Design a protein around this ligand. Structure first.
Ligand SMILES: *[C@@H]1O[C@H](CO)[C@@H](O[C@@H]2O[C@H](CO)[C@@H](O[C@@H]3O[C@H](CO[C@H]4O[C@H](CO)[C@@H](O)[C@H](O)[C@@H]4O)[C@@H](O)[C@H](O[C@H]4O[C@H](CO)[C@@H](O)[C@H](O)[C@@H]4O)[C@@H]3O)[C@H](O)[C@H]2NC(C)=O)[C@H](O)[C@H]1NC(C)=O
Ligand SMILES: *[C@@H]1O[C@H](CO[C@@H]2O[C@@H](C)[C@@H](O)[C@@H](O)[C@@H]2O)[C@@H](O[C@@H]2O[C@H](CO)[C@@H](O)[C@H](O)[C@H]2NC(C)=O)[C@H](O)[C@H]1NC(C)=O
Ligand SMILES: *[C@@H]1O[C@H](CO[C@@H]2O[C@@H](C)[C@@H](O)[C@@H](O)[C@@H]2O)[C@@H](O[C@@H]2O[C@H](CO)[C@@H](O)[C@H](O)[C@H]2NC(C)=O)[C@H](O)[C@H]1NC(C)=O
Ligand SMILES: *[C@@H]1O[C@H](CO)[C@@H](O[C@@H]2O[C@H](CO)[C@@H](O)[C@H](O)[C@H]2NC(C)=O)[C@H](O)[C@H]1NC(C)=O
Ligand SMILES: C[N+](C)(C)CCOP(=O)(O)O
Ligand SMILES: [Zn+2]
Ligand SMILES: [Zn+2]
Length: 426
């Protein structure tokens, strides 16, 4: 007779879950035709290799492929309280074949697709470098694209997020279904090498100042933060000594993340179209923060490349009310199989804790895994290299130089530690 909240039965609180999808790269031109140089504009005159209804390795995504990915999510039976979506919706075609209006039209199509299929799901998007015309030229002041995506994403974001999105293409947002969790969606395309608009700027769009203030507020308000962005921090795992964003920005952003590692419970990136891990550590090798690079839905590659990825989407599990990451489930589409029979079978690729026999996704757990990778002929690393391409090629091999680059980039996000790793292991 005193209106006290009803106590839940002391069962185990189910884990929380969220989806991460990235790099959809819709090619609206995709159509099967006898002249394989006309299957898709994204192959740029090359012959599609073996095209089917769900795509080709030399093409960006048919609409049917993207629809199959989101249909899989919708029908998966997995509960999820939100989704993160880290950008890159238009296809890889020459600048004159696009325009601002065409870019906005593709992002609108992808946004409405998600909203139609998932009417009750809060989605946290970030912009990719292709989400602007010309590609990679994302500005440091408001623009038509920023204003358009701010309008498109209003169903998911509050007024303050909309206002920063419109001005600079970034925002933070409290997660409605998850009190105490805030998403910080950065515009790391401001730091991407090809961006002429940010050359020699110390703090383009004031994003560093805003990020520091946001994290400081989260720290004092006892929030936890998930960082999402398109281009990741750290070093390319397939090239030597090449930061993914300009070195000046990589060093500055990493220093902010080290300072606020106690608040940041996850970092989630796209852009590479590969499945990669990184572990941010301090200068002495003590692990601080776990980083998860998710592979793309598009399978596209250039003619020059030997390997590509199968389409992928992924699910994270986390501790409710606490937001510590517990697991990651990677799903994929075997594109060759799907095209041969004409029917998609999105399926489990792996569960991280089971694949690698780790307890959870905390920095110390993953740091110990990466130390295993470093051992000669590590079977853990062989598995990881297979998953890097989302199981595209079980016979792909990683020679000594290849592996040094991979492991050094997983373990060492800043220039000093990365170069020291090269010194010791080249
Ligand atoms: C996604 O789905 C695709 C399609 O089903 C799978 O790809 C097929 O995988 C099978 C088995 O792994 C392949 O069949 C095997 O091919 C081997 C030779 O492979 C090389 O040469 C072929 C030549 O056509 C290339 O296509 C290929 O890329 C390789 O470079 C053979 O050695 C195998 O023969 C053995 O099989 C049995 C017993 O093992 C016996 O009958 C044989 O005598 C011999 O012992 C076998 O034929 C098949 O070629 C692949 N198809 C395609 C189109 O690539 C992927 O595995 C799947 N992905 C995942 C992650 O599961
Ligand atoms: C794109 O492919 C066409 C077709 O190539 C043929 O078809 C494939 C299935 C494979 O069997 C190839 O070895 C074949 O040659 C290419 O056009 C052909 O190229 C040569 C040189 O001109 C000639 O023998 C054919 O007559 C050409 N045309 C046709 C209709 O066969 C074309 O060169 C390829 N384009 C690119 C950019 O690679
Ligand atoms: C980081 O934040 C602290 C705390 O600021 C407060 O945080 C919230 C309660 C919010 O209500 C803000 O308005 C508050 O100001 C900053 O330290 C405070 O501000 C100055 C620091 O020189 C000092 O006079 C206050 O006493 C500090 N308050 C407390 C509780 O310690 C700190 O400076 C911020 N850092 C940056 C870089 O912004
Ligand atoms: C997103 O774009 C796709 C096509 O790129 C749309 O799907 C097609 O829509 C037109 C009809 O208007 C036709 O080509 C087909 O009927 C549809 N399917 C395919 C595979 O092309 C889709 O409707 C768009 N969605 C939104 C929300 O704009
Ligand atoms: C640049 N890349 C080809 C290595 C990765 C893909 O990047 P993006 O062109 O989709 O932005
Ligand atoms: Zn991309
Ligand atoms: Zn990109």
């Amino acid at each position: 007779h005193k209106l006290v909240p009803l106590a839940p039965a002391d069962r185990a609180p189910a884990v929380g879950q969220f989806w991460h999808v990235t790099d959809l790269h819709l090619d609206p031109t995709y159509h099967i035709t006898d002249d394989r140089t006309k299957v898709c504009a994204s192959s740029k005159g090359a012959n599609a290799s073996n095209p089917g209804p769900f795509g080709d390795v030399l093409c960006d995504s048919p609409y049917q492929l993207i629809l199959s990915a989101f249909d899989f999510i919708k029908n998966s039976g997995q509960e999820a309280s939100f989704m993160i979506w880290t950008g890159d919706s238009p296809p890889h075609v020459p600048v004159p074949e696009l325009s601002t209006g065409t870019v906005i039209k593709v992002i609108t199509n992808m946004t409405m697709t998600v909203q139609n299929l998932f009417p009750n799901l809060q989605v946290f998007p970030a912009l990719g470098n292709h989400d602007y015309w010309p590609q990679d030229q994302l500005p440091i002041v408001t623009s038509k694209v920023y204003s358009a995506v701010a309008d498109l994403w209003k169903p998911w974001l509050g007024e303050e997020a909309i206002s920063t999105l419109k001005k600079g293409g970034f925002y933070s947002q409290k997660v409605a279904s998850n009190p105490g969790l805030r998403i910080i969606s950065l515009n790391t395309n401001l730091y991407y090498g090809p961006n002429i608009m940010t050359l020699n700027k110390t703090d383009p769009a004031n994003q560093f100042e805003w990020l520091e203030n946001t994290l400081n507020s989260s720290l004092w308000n006892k929030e936890k933060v998930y960082i999402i962005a398109h281009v990741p921090v750290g070093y390319l795992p397939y090239a030597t000594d090449t930061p993914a964003i300009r070195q000046y920005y990589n060093e500055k952003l990493l220093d902010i993340f080290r300072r606020y590692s106690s608040v940041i419970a996850g970092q989630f990136y796209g852009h590479t179209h590969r499945d990669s891990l990184m572990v941010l550590s301090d200068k002495n090798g003590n692990p601080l923060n776990s980083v998860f690079v998710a592979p793309a839905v598009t399978p596209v590659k250039g003619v020059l490349q030997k390997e590509t990825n199968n389409p992928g989407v992924r699910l994270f599990q986390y501790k409710p009310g606490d937001y510590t990451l517990l697991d990651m489930v990677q799903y994929y589409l075997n594109l060759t199989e799907a095209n041969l029979k004409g029917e998609s079978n999105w399926t489990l690729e792996y569960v991280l804790t089971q694949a690698y026999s780790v307890a959870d996704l905390q920095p110390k757990s993953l740091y110990a895994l990466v130390q295993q990778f470093a051992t000669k002929d590590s079977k853990q690393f062989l598995k990881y290299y297979h998953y890097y391409f989302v199981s595209y090629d079980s016979s792909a091999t990683c020679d000594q130089h290849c592996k040094t680059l991979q492991v050094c980039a997983i373990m060492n996000l800043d220039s000093m530690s990365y170069d020291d790793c090269l010194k010791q292991h080249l």
